[PDB]
Amino acid sequence: RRHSVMLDCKLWKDDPIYFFKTLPPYISKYAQRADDASIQAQIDVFGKDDVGAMPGALGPRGNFAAVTFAESFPDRVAMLAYLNEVLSFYECFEKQMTEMLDATLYANPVPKDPKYDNPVWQANYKNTMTKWPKILENLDPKLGPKCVKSLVALVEGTDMEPKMAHYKTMKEYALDRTNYIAWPVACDNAEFGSQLNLTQDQLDSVRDIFLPLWTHSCYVYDYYHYDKEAEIHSTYGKGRSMINSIPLLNRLKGLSVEEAKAWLKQRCFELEKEYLQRKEDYFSENPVEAVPVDLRRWFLSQEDLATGFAIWCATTYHNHPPFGEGYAAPYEKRRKEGALWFEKVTESDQLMTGGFEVRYAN
Q: What is the CATH number of the domain that holds 301?
A: 1.10.600.10
What whole-number distance in Å separates Cα of residue 190 and Cα of residue 80?
9
Q: Is 5 helix (H, G, I), strand (E, B) or coil?
A: strand
| DSSP letters for 88-138 | TTHHHHHHHHHHHTT----SPPPP--GGG--HHHHHHHHHHHHHHHHHHHH
Residue 210 placed within a domain: yes
Identity (one letter) of the amino acid at 255?
L
CB half-sphere exposure, 211, CA atoms < 13 A = 13
| DSSP letters for 296-329 | HHHHHHHHHHHHHHHHHHTT-TTTSTTGGGGGHH
Q: Are 110 and 91 in contact (CB under 8 A)?
A: yes
Residue 357 placed within a domain: no
What angle, rounded to 10 degrees, do the helices at 200-235 and 170-180 form?
Answer: 90
Query: Which letter does DSSP use for residue 2 in this model?
Result: -
Residue 344 placed within a domain: no
Q: For the chain, what is the domain count? A: 1
Query: Which letter does DSSP use for residue 355 in this model?
Result: B
Secondary structure of 153-198 as H, E, C letters: HHHCCCCCHHHCCCCCCHHHHHHHHHHHCCHHHHHHHHHHHCCCCC
Of 101, 107, 73, 108, the residue nearest 86 (C-alpha): 101
Q: Is 26 helix (H, G, I), strand (E, B) or coil?
A: strand
Residue 362 placed within a domain: no
* Strand 26-28 relative to strand 5-7, pairing: antiparallel
Domain that holds residue 65: 5-337
Residue 351 placed within a domain: no
Give the CA distances from residue 40 to residues 51, 69, 216, 336, in Å, rounded to whole numbers and listed in that order.
Answer: 9, 19, 31, 16
What whole-number distance in Å separates Cα of residue 34 and Cα of residue 322?
20
Identity (one letter) of the amino acid at 134?
K
Non-local (6+) Cβ contacts of 135 within 8 A are 79, 350, 351
What whole-number distance in Å separates Cα of residue 122 and Cα of residue 245?
31
Length, in residues, of the chain = 362
What whole-number distance in Å separates Cα of residue 95 and Cα of residue 230?
23
Residue 319 placed within a domain: yes
Non-local (6+) Cβ contacts of 201 within 8 A are none
Give the CA distances from residue 3 to residues 15, 27, 242, 300, in Å, rounded to whole numbers and listed in that order.
Answer: 27, 12, 41, 11
Non-local (6+) Cβ contacts of 221 within 8 A are 181, 309, 313
Give kind and range of the element (H or E) at residue 55.
none
**Distance from first CA to last CA of the chain, Å, rounded?**
26
Q: Are 348 and 342 in contact (CB under 8 A)?
A: yes
